[PDB]
Amino acid sequence: KNSVSVDLPGSMKVLVSKSSNADGKYDLIATVDALELSGTSDKNNGSGVLEGVKADASKVKLTISDDLGQTTLEVFKSDGSTLVSKKVTSKDKSSTHELFNEKGELSLKYITRADKSSTLELFNEKGELSLKYITRADKSSTYEHFNEKGELSEKEITRADKSSTYELFNEKGELSLKYITRADGTRLEYTGIKSDGSGKAKEVLKGYVLEGTLTAEKTTLVVKEGTVTLSKNISKSGEVSVELNDTDSSAATKKTAAWNSGTSTLTITVNSKKTKDLVFTSSNTITVQQYDSNGTSLEGSAVEITKLDEIKNALK
What we know:
By secondary structure, the protein is mostly beta strands. The chain has one helix and 27 strands.
């Protein structure tokens, strides 16, 4: 008829009649999630109660506060009293969304705040938290999923700098797999972890992947080329160290190397002459640079490694 359309918290609209009826009251109509709700308010601004009935006989109730700052959207069973669901939303767009089990307790609670952070909670038939997913205003987040025993089954923690840790547990609740994603996208992938702390390790860099092992004290990624084995060692605090071993006994060709932790540089020597510098940068890259044919000092420029063969080549 002659209605005014009013925008409501929670992305809903209501139509309220412009003209009061015989009793000073106003007709209200709203469509929410395809259901047409209707009511009658003694207010003329779109506040009041609207109600509807779904095809499965659920009753729906929309309550709009007097100043239009809040809406409450309730779904009941057919008695119109047993609460199935409830969504409360404020003008600042903070909102709580609740689902309720057949006991009338919460099975799900989802809260969004004004700063856009949010928490999702799921609860099993025991009333215990089975899943939690929080996101914060800086887009960091925590994900926890619990098995029927109530132990962790999966956990992912993401930071503001986009680094993250993903953890997966076996049916016994013990840590099986762990992925550490650095701020720059490079990854440490731990798999086949056993209860004694060891397992298989991969570092996924930009362009190539290193393989190795995890033990009690460090991760060791190994690159072997013929007689020469280069071992990249990351301690528990992420402090990188590098070893090189050459089983070539011939003095004309054998590779020695000296690791300088201050410079993050492995300097390779052949036949009493320096030959190349390998720099393990703080940005999870490797560069190689060659010394001159006299071993005096470096020549040309450093080249950032983009492929595993380039590491192998530097070891020939």
